Design a binder for this molecule. Sequence first.
Ligand SMILES: C[C@H](CC#CC(C)(C)O)[C@H]1CCC2/C(=C/C=C3C[C@@H](O)C[C@H](O)C3)CCC[C@@]21C
Length: 253
Amino acid sequence: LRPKLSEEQQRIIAILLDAHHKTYDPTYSDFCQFRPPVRVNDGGGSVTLELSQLSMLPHLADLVSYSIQKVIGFAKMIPGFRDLTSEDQIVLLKSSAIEVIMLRSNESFTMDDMSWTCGNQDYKYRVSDVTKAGHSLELIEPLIKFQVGLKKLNLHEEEHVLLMAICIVSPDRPGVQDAALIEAIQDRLSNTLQTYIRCRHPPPGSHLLYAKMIQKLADLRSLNEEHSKQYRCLSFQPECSMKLTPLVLEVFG
Ligand SMILES: C[C@H](CC#CC(C)(C)O)[C@H]1CCC2/C(=C/C=C3C[C@@H](O)C[C@H](O)C3)CCC[C@@]21C
């Protein structure tokens, strides 16, 4: 059976599309306000050199910090999010922040050359730029594989925004108090997504798409864990805090 989207489900989708359009600038016009990207010579991918310089960290830290602010704005507009306690809202945002950034970044990722292209060549980020920020291939390679996999699903914008919302409102995050309420909120979003796919998404791949999307959420958890491990290592580097931002320090600290 392929039941039609209820008026409420249609409303949820409209609200999320609006939230995304207000919090994701497809022109990347604010990027010139971040600390400038610096790309030193490191064809050898020397960990020692990368850690001593962290040339791309200030720029990427600003980009990530800016993104967290946009994610906070998006989350506040998710139907039901405001009904949670502030304590639970913060737990959900802090635990999902890196995952939603990875998801939303798919919009600027291009399979033409496997990079995140955000306008001019100065704002084109490749694997080599991430290593210059202190991270290693143990995170980057799986990250790129994840981006290509997500890209290949060719999600409608409606599906893309529902996925980010579902990612944020997850009941199995450590520290949440009212898991039941959170689960209820997520279920409403999941049912909307499942109904949308069967009703609005044409073949091939009509079905199975939901399963593939859910698997991506599992993939994000692993990437989250690896990023946390690497962030810890990065925090050991003297004077690193100055290259980050207060928001980044709190969310990942
Ligand atoms: C591992 C990085 C995250 C980090 C970090 C620190 C340095 C804080 O550990 C990568 C996560 C995904 C990502 C990237 C995200 C890019 C997006 C630009 C635009 O799509 C708006 C998104 O909102 C942000 C590309 C360059 C490497 C990263 C910044």
